[PDB]
Amino acid sequence: KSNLIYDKDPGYVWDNKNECEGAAEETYQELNYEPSISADKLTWTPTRLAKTVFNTYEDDDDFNVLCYFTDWSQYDPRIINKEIRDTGGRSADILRLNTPDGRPFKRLIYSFGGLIGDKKYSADGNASIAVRLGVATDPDDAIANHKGKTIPVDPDGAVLASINCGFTKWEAGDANERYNQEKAKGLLGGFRLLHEADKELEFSLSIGGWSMSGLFSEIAKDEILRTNFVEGIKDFFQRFPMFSHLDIDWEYPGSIGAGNPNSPDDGANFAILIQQITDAKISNLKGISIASSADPAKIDAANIPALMDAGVTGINLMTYDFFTLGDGKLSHHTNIYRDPSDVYSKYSIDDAVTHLIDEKKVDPKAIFIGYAGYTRNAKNATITTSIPSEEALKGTYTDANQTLGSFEYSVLEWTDIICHYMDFEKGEGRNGYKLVHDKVAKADYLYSEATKVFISLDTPRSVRDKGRYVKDKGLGGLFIWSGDQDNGILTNAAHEGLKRRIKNKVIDMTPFYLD
């Protein structure tokens, strides 16, 4: 009996039927997923297995909690009938955020807008998408006249869908017809429904992200491309007046990121672009944020000073994915602290924050730090710490190809954690897994002696401590990567770390912190 999870996929009512009761468990059966044994499987667990438990808190202090909401998280072909069970989607309902009497986030960040001409991401540089959205007359025109212009790269998910976007029936209309605020369905229509329920909620577009930063370096160097880019912002902000913020998540100026063109002049060029956007005087655009790596060497390479000199008002510090497979050592993925000589957990929020404030003279209040709705794992792992309960995490792994995850190898998402890996209500691990608190990092991890799988994750305890860090250090606030993953437990912990008075109580968080 649980206030956090369901014991069986409750399904989803669509067109007066519910075709996906138990769908999550049918997938598990088809794939032979067993939590206490599987080291090398995907779960495909839908967020439907979690109960929705966002509290709300007074949020009118000097901090803000932001939410990256991904436009692919709505999908799950299991919803429609009984045909597909060997794979699935996240099925993340935008309506989990529709709380009474407040909001779990001040600002929802649509993730992600792509760029016309981006041939790293798209074989045709998104040209067919431009045509479908009605911003180009044919694919040649898209590239010839609109290179550098932003558009959502998933028009179904952005402006057409019903399921998990707050709508209850299919209606005729193409993407071109619906690519504006009042006609949108999809996630942008879902954002509008939340806008209509809550006038204080803010909306940001994030352009780029890890897979879509391939075109930034080229755009920022070029006055005609910068001009197309600014036009892209004006167009989107005219089509969707409810938007008021822009996150240009170029990952990262001056360094390699996912394998992008890059140049030492990227940050200086990016600063020209941000000024050019400011100069357009888009009446509803109140603020521009950018992304920063947590690696001080990559921070140096980004020329953060140039960007702040051009009037950037926020830095979303991408404090997650610190554990990357490849070097045979375990690591925390989103930890606040580390010992300076640590070769396992090589990065930390604190190292990065200190670097920005002390070396780059960034205003602390501009900085937002991340908490994560997902994990970074390695199978075939060995914990080598001498006293795990008192000492910093150390450990190694051999072959971690095809490690346990939810939708992609090596990454479990939050629903899987609370349903099959950790029992926060009983205060202990599930299915042969044990939770360890690393007091040096102030981060928790999960590990099973039986499966030999190591799982680095955020918990209520660490997210609360991140909220505490933000407050102590006077930072801007926190963001979740990504908010569609959270059932509310993570975000509750953030608000509590900020010392916020509760307004609407759905769940008592007290027993979930475990000291």
XYZ file of C-alpha atoms in Angstrom:
515
model
C 0.000 0.000 0.000
C 1.663 3.239 -1.155
C 1.106 6.962 -1.454
C 3.908 7.233 -4.013
C 3.230 4.444 -6.544
C 0.683 2.132 -8.073
C 1.211 -1.617 -7.956
C -0.220 -1.923 -11.487
C -0.185 0.457 -14.484
C -3.551 2.244 -14.064
C -3.622 3.009 -17.769
C -5.030 6.025 -19.555
C -8.589 6.766 -20.635
C -8.813 7.828 -24.238
C -11.922 7.995 -26.492
C -13.989 6.367 -23.713
C -11.805 3.263 -23.384
C -8.842 2.255 -21.267
C -6.627 0.006 -23.335
C -3.450 0.087 -21.224
C -4.317 -1.122 -17.753
C -1.347 -3.247 -16.709
C 0.546 -2.244 -19.884
C 3.795 -1.505 -17.984
C 3.765 -5.010 -16.450
C 2.939 -6.645 -19.794
C 6.068 -5.006 -21.218
C 8.092 -6.289 -18.260
C 6.805 -9.836 -18.932
C 7.542 -9.619 -22.701
C 11.085 -8.412 -22.078
C 11.721 -10.590 -19.033
C 12.524 -7.574 -16.890
C 12.971 -8.553 -13.272
C 14.167 -5.745 -10.923
C 16.197 -7.929 -8.521
C 18.073 -9.696 -11.322
C 18.158 -7.622 -14.549
C 21.452 -5.829 -15.143
C 21.160 -5.237 -18.889
C 17.523 -4.567 -19.768
C 15.293 -1.628 -20.652
C 12.122 -1.305 -18.530
C 10.116 1.148 -20.706
C 8.266 2.117 -17.474
C 5.587 4.780 -18.034
C 5.276 7.689 -15.530
C 1.643 6.404 -14.999
C 2.986 3.957 -12.430
C 3.783 6.884 -10.086
C 1.192 8.725 -8.008
C 1.157 12.507 -8.477
C 2.312 14.240 -5.305
C 3.435 17.808 -6.041
C 2.805 20.022 -3.001
C 2.846 23.792 -3.568
C 4.809 26.323 -1.551
C 4.974 30.129 -1.342
C 7.338 31.014 -4.109
C 7.372 34.780 -3.932
C 10.848 35.034 -2.308
C 14.096 35.865 -4.089
C 14.429 32.392 -5.752
C 12.774 30.522 -8.663
C 12.395 26.799 -9.485
C 12.337 26.076 -13.241
C 11.226 23.035 -15.177
C 12.610 21.573 -18.403
C 9.534 19.862 -19.949
C 10.462 17.649 -22.938
C 8.074 17.352 -25.844
C 8.803 13.654 -26.430
C 7.867 12.581 -22.929
C 4.104 12.572 -23.805
C 4.375 9.498 -26.104
C 3.493 5.889 -25.497
C 2.051 3.714 -28.289
C 0.799 1.268 -25.584
C -2.012 3.715 -24.810
C -3.926 3.035 -28.075
C -4.610 -0.717 -27.991
C -3.069 -4.091 -27.122
C -0.779 -4.409 -30.123
C 2.530 -2.900 -28.936
C 3.983 -4.195 -25.670
C 7.649 -4.904 -26.400
C 8.479 -1.171 -26.174
C 6.788 1.956 -24.829
C 6.919 5.638 -23.958
C 7.087 7.797 -20.852
C 3.464 8.926 -21.172
C 4.175 12.093 -19.083
C 0.922 14.040 -18.619
C 1.469 17.847 -18.675
C -1.558 17.917 -16.336
C 0.496 16.547 -13.393
C 1.668 20.123 -13.063
C -1.852 21.558 -12.734
C -1.817 21.933 -8.934
C -4.380 23.835 -6.830
C -3.336 27.025 -5.045
C 0.118 27.749 -6.481
C 2.529 26.039 -8.857
C 5.365 23.553 -8.503
C 7.529 25.683 -10.887
C 7.629 29.407 -11.586
C 8.677 28.841 -15.201
C 8.171 25.925 -17.649
C 10.844 25.607 -20.305
C 9.678 24.015 -23.580
C 12.400 21.542 -24.630
C 13.468 21.892 -27.393
C 13.339 24.243 -30.255
C 15.735 23.232 -33.095
C 17.212 25.312 -35.895
C 16.598 25.299 -39.615
C 19.794 24.270 -41.416
C 21.035 21.961 -38.563
C 22.445 19.011 -40.520
C 24.029 17.377 -37.485
C 20.584 16.797 -35.993
C 18.544 16.345 -39.202
C 19.347 14.855 -42.607
C 17.513 17.774 -44.250
C 18.340 20.458 -41.682
C 14.684 20.434 -40.394
C 13.462 21.766 -43.712
C 10.488 19.463 -43.939
C 9.461 20.536 -40.464
C 9.639 24.207 -41.502
C 7.250 23.475 -44.398
C 4.823 21.532 -42.226
C 4.708 24.376 -39.661
C 3.977 26.899 -42.402
C 7.146 28.963 -41.959
C 8.643 27.963 -45.334
C 7.073 27.385 -48.676
C 9.178 24.281 -49.687
C 12.392 22.669 -48.369
C 14.656 24.716 -50.672
C 13.050 27.924 -49.364
C 13.495 26.748 -45.741
C 17.271 26.459 -46.113
C 17.726 29.406 -48.550
C 15.688 31.929 -46.550
C 15.526 30.685 -43.023
C 18.807 29.102 -41.990
C 19.246 29.775 -38.224
C 15.531 30.242 -37.544
C 14.168 28.281 -34.526
C 11.149 25.949 -34.752
C 9.971 23.036 -32.621
C 11.307 19.916 -34.361
C 8.298 17.742 -33.341
C 5.121 19.426 -34.647
C 2.931 16.530 -33.489
C 4.153 16.837 -29.984
C 4.334 20.655 -30.052
C 0.949 21.713 -31.488
C -1.205 18.654 -32.526
C -1.368 15.986 -29.881
C -4.171 15.409 -27.363
C -2.987 12.487 -25.250
C -0.938 13.720 -22.198
C -1.295 17.316 -23.402
C -4.629 18.015 -21.710
C -7.085 17.447 -24.609
C -9.684 14.698 -24.858
C -10.667 14.227 -28.468
C -9.098 14.255 -31.936
C -9.992 17.341 -33.992
C -9.197 18.181 -37.582
C -6.434 20.781 -38.281
C -2.859 20.656 -39.561
C 0.327 21.899 -37.890
C 0.353 25.106 -39.955
C -3.185 25.929 -38.712
C -2.284 25.168 -35.122
C 1.136 26.827 -34.880
C -0.110 29.752 -32.745
C -1.156 30.108 -29.155
C -4.871 30.093 -29.405
C -5.109 27.147 -31.855
C -2.338 24.987 -30.467
C -2.889 21.527 -29.092
C 0.209 19.448 -28.212
C 2.518 20.522 -25.403
C 2.323 24.179 -26.368
C -1.537 23.822 -26.027
C -0.914 22.109 -22.725
C 1.291 25.070 -21.622
C -1.665 27.301 -22.643
C -4.083 25.301 -20.465
C -1.720 25.846 -17.512
C -1.380 29.519 -18.468
C -5.230 29.771 -18.312
C -5.407 28.119 -14.921
C -2.537 30.200 -13.452
C -1.702 33.704 -14.506
C 1.582 33.774 -12.579
C 3.114 30.772 -14.412
C 5.957 31.829 -16.806
C 6.977 30.137 -20.071
C 10.383 29.890 -21.685
C 11.509 28.390 -24.988
C 14.788 26.444 -24.824
C 16.582 26.425 -28.139
C 19.313 23.778 -28.670
C 20.164 21.267 -25.978
C 22.739 18.463 -26.251
C 21.650 16.993 -29.651
C 20.834 20.315 -31.291
C 23.885 22.589 -30.702
C 25.553 21.695 -34.036
C 24.585 24.920 -35.830
C 25.246 27.619 -33.135
C 28.922 28.288 -33.853
C 28.169 28.872 -37.551
C 25.136 31.108 -36.845
C 26.859 33.266 -34.211
C 29.769 34.151 -36.566
C 27.511 35.398 -39.338
C 25.535 38.593 -39.430
C 22.884 37.271 -41.900
C 22.419 34.081 -39.852
C 22.234 36.034 -36.598
C 19.571 38.184 -38.246
C 17.557 35.056 -39.274
C 17.957 33.814 -35.734
C 16.571 37.039 -34.222
C 13.652 36.817 -36.723
C 13.052 33.278 -35.436
C 12.691 34.637 -31.913
C 10.393 37.454 -33.001
C 8.170 35.060 -34.963
C 7.848 32.534 -32.132
C 7.169 35.260 -29.553
C 4.485 36.779 -31.784
C 2.826 33.364 -32.338
C 2.907 32.559 -28.573
C 2.485 35.818 -26.589
C 2.345 33.927 -23.323
C 6.101 33.228 -23.576
C 8.346 35.700 -21.733
C 11.785 33.985 -21.452
C 14.377 32.422 -23.761
C 16.906 29.715 -22.805
C 19.601 29.477 -25.516
C 21.075 26.143 -24.453
C 24.080 26.064 -26.723
C 26.101 23.203 -25.289
C 28.707 24.660 -25.319
C 30.383 27.648 -26.874
C 34.131 27.114 -27.296
C 34.116 23.324 -26.704
C 33.149 20.023 -28.348
C 29.790 19.184 -26.632
C 28.075 16.362 -28.588
C 30.465 16.772 -31.500
C 29.767 20.283 -32.782
C 31.635 22.838 -34.806
C 33.255 25.137 -32.216
C 35.689 28.053 -32.003
C 37.491 30.091 -29.291
C 35.450 33.051 -30.550
C 32.128 31.289 -29.874
C 31.337 33.079 -26.563
C 32.164 36.534 -28.007
C 30.078 35.765 -31.080
C 27.229 34.490 -28.882
C 27.359 37.805 -26.984
C 26.795 39.711 -30.273
C 23.782 37.455 -30.905
C 22.288 38.044 -27.469
C 22.666 41.818 -27.855
C 21.069 41.565 -31.338
C 18.061 39.728 -29.841
C 17.771 42.366 -27.104
C 17.926 45.108 -29.746
C 14.920 43.665 -31.621
C 12.785 44.918 -28.690
C 10.450 41.938 -28.641
C 7.874 43.329 -26.203
C 7.102 40.084 -24.369
C 10.738 38.898 -24.045
C 11.827 39.782 -20.482
C 14.939 37.615 -20.040
C 17.547 35.439 -21.824
C 19.354 32.556 -20.080
C 22.225 30.460 -21.441
C 23.691 27.011 -20.609
C 27.048 26.465 -18.903
C 29.055 23.255 -18.394
C 30.086 22.413 -14.833
C 33.704 21.621 -15.981
C 35.809 24.736 -15.158
C 37.922 24.207 -18.308
C 34.779 24.290 -20.422
C 33.520 27.304 -18.486
C 36.791 29.086 -19.339
C 36.375 28.204 -22.965
C 32.805 29.592 -23.132
C 33.726 33.220 -22.377
C 31.004 33.678 -19.773
C 32.091 37.305 -19.132
C 31.239 38.277 -22.769
C 27.762 36.753 -22.317
C 27.075 38.602 -19.061
C 28.370 41.857 -20.672
C 25.662 41.379 -23.314
C 22.853 41.320 -20.684
C 22.173 37.632 -20.142
C 20.043 37.360 -16.983
C 20.328 33.659 -16.152
C 22.811 30.819 -16.384
C 21.399 27.353 -16.245
C 24.400 25.453 -14.860
C 24.086 21.945 -16.296
C 24.995 20.127 -13.094
C 24.139 16.549 -14.169
C 25.726 13.785 -16.318
C 28.989 14.104 -14.342
C 29.256 10.286 -14.668
C 30.004 9.385 -18.315
C 30.863 5.795 -19.288
C 34.299 5.247 -20.704
C 37.021 5.505 -18.090
C 36.112 2.546 -15.937
C 35.487 4.523 -12.714
C 32.182 5.053 -10.940
C 31.089 8.657 -10.225
C 28.176 10.615 -8.847
C 26.293 12.272 -11.721
C 24.799 15.398 -10.115
C 26.575 15.826 -6.734
C 26.898 19.106 -4.821
C 30.399 18.559 -3.414
C 33.602 16.666 -4.057
C 37.058 16.386 -2.605
C 39.385 18.366 -4.892
C 41.589 15.305 -5.500
C 38.627 13.045 -6.377
C 39.293 11.087 -9.624
C 35.979 9.177 -9.533
C 33.497 12.087 -9.110
C 35.444 14.652 -11.124
C 32.851 17.459 -11.125
C 30.532 19.093 -8.604
C 27.953 21.851 -8.400
C 30.119 23.615 -5.871
C 33.297 23.587 -7.995
C 31.353 25.028 -10.873
C 29.455 27.648 -8.887
C 32.676 28.755 -7.124
C 34.389 29.025 -10.477
C 31.623 31.209 -11.967
C 31.353 33.560 -8.976
C 35.014 33.763 -7.965
C 36.883 33.574 -11.278
C 34.333 34.852 -13.739
C 32.665 37.398 -11.408
C 29.129 36.265 -12.265
C 26.356 37.605 -10.062
C 25.370 34.645 -7.850
C 21.685 35.465 -8.258
C 21.995 34.749 -12.067
C 22.940 31.108 -11.436
C 20.515 28.188 -11.487
C 21.696 24.717 -10.515
C 20.180 21.434 -11.720
C 18.528 18.513 -10.055
C 17.904 15.345 -12.080
C 14.839 13.164 -12.680
C 17.007 10.307 -13.895
C 20.116 8.275 -13.083
C 23.515 7.311 -14.571
C 24.359 3.656 -14.009
C 27.062 1.052 -14.694
C 26.662 -2.726 -14.548
C 29.643 -4.985 -13.683
C 30.468 -2.420 -10.994
C 32.506 -2.791 -7.788
C 32.298 -0.428 -4.842
C 35.865 0.033 -3.442
C 35.147 2.657 -0.712
C 36.466 1.280 2.632
C 33.594 2.565 4.835
C 30.770 3.523 2.408
C 28.716 5.087 5.240
C 31.474 7.572 6.101
C 33.814 7.979 3.122
C 33.681 9.330 -0.455
C 32.397 6.987 -3.189
C 35.225 5.110 -5.045
C 34.576 2.193 -7.361
C 35.182 0.661 -10.783
C 33.417 -1.252 -13.556
C 34.454 -3.386 -16.495
C 31.965 -3.841 -19.302
C 29.077 -1.394 -19.008
C 27.760 -1.523 -22.565
C 23.993 -2.261 -22.413
C 23.571 -1.393 -18.717
C 20.136 -1.373 -17.120
C 17.912 1.623 -17.914
C 14.345 2.786 -18.661
C 14.300 4.141 -22.209
C 18.017 4.181 -23.067
C 20.856 2.010 -21.757
C 22.517 3.191 -18.448
C 19.790 5.758 -17.490
C 16.860 4.839 -15.216
C 14.161 7.473 -14.750
C 12.461 8.592 -11.559
C 9.361 6.375 -11.857
C 11.481 3.251 -12.074
C 13.445 4.381 -9.030
C 10.430 4.793 -6.738
C 8.599 1.714 -8.072
C 11.441 -0.841 -8.284
C 14.705 0.495 -6.764
C 14.018 2.586 -3.667
C 11.162 2.507 -1.099
C 11.256 6.008 0.363
C 8.212 5.253 2.511
C 9.918 2.338 4.301
C 13.231 4.193 4.110
C 15.096 1.433 2.276
C 16.099 -0.030 -1.047
C 13.956 -2.451 -3.009
C 14.771 -5.684 -4.784
C 18.253 -6.338 -3.482
C 19.377 -2.685 -3.813
C 20.736 -0.659 -0.901
C 20.946 3.121 -0.645
C 24.228 4.670 0.476
C 24.749 8.255 1.551
C 28.124 9.651 0.574
C 28.847 12.363 3.217
C 31.715 13.913 1.289
C 29.638 14.556 -1.883
C 26.305 14.926 -0.003
C 24.836 12.585 -2.663
C 23.211 9.194 -2.530
C 23.682 6.163 -4.733
C 22.059 2.692 -5.041
C 23.912 -0.558 -5.473
C 22.994 -4.249 -5.625
C 25.572 -6.900 -4.672
C 23.391 -9.371 -6.670
C 23.182 -7.487 -10.015
C 26.425 -5.499 -9.567
C 24.629 -2.460 -10.954
C 25.658 0.968 -9.612
C 23.003 3.747 -9.842
C 23.828 7.444 -9.256
C 20.621 9.433 -8.604
C 19.181 12.489 -6.933
C 16.970 11.895 -3.910
C 14.701 14.086 -1.779
C 17.652 14.353 0.607
C 20.106 15.615 -2.021
C 17.597 17.877 -3.748
C 16.688 19.397 -0.402
C 20.395 19.950 0.161
C 20.688 21.590 -3.223
C 17.866 23.966 -2.228
C 19.811 24.618 0.983
C 22.974 25.397 -1.048
C 21.091 27.801 -3.317
C 19.726 29.709 -0.274
C 23.034 29.769 1.625
C 24.882 31.016 -1.434
C 22.165 33.418 -2.658
C 21.845 31.768 -6.072
C 18.958 32.272 -8.573
C 17.324 28.957 -7.838
C 17.102 25.461 -9.285
C 15.900 23.718 -12.398
C 14.859 20.097 -12.938
C 16.247 18.106 -15.904
C 13.616 17.109 -16.732
C 10.356 17.925 -14.933
C 8.297 15.442 -16.900
C 10.130 12.703 -14.967
C 9.167 13.926 -11.509
C 5.984 12.674 -9.751
C 6.490 15.635 -7.316
C 8.818 14.190 -4.629
C 11.974 15.731 -6.103
C 10.459 19.158 -6.634
C 8.852 19.204 -3.129
C 12.370 18.668 -1.725
C 13.712 21.608 -3.670
C 11.075 23.972 -2.258
C 11.688 22.611 1.246
C 15.460 23.208 0.880
C 14.614 26.802 -0.024
C 12.788 26.922 3.345
C 9.407 27.608 1.683
C 6.183 27.617 3.626
C 3.839 24.966 2.324
C 0.527 26.151 0.844
C -1.147 22.983 -0.455
C -0.153 19.743 1.151
C -0.713 16.516 -0.828
C 2.015 14.470 0.877
C 4.112 14.716 3.990
C 7.773 14.734 2.851
C 9.208 14.224 6.341
C 9.965 10.500 6.328
C 11.520 10.562 2.800
C 14.727 12.435 3.703
C 16.056 9.730 6.064
C 17.999 12.105 8.366
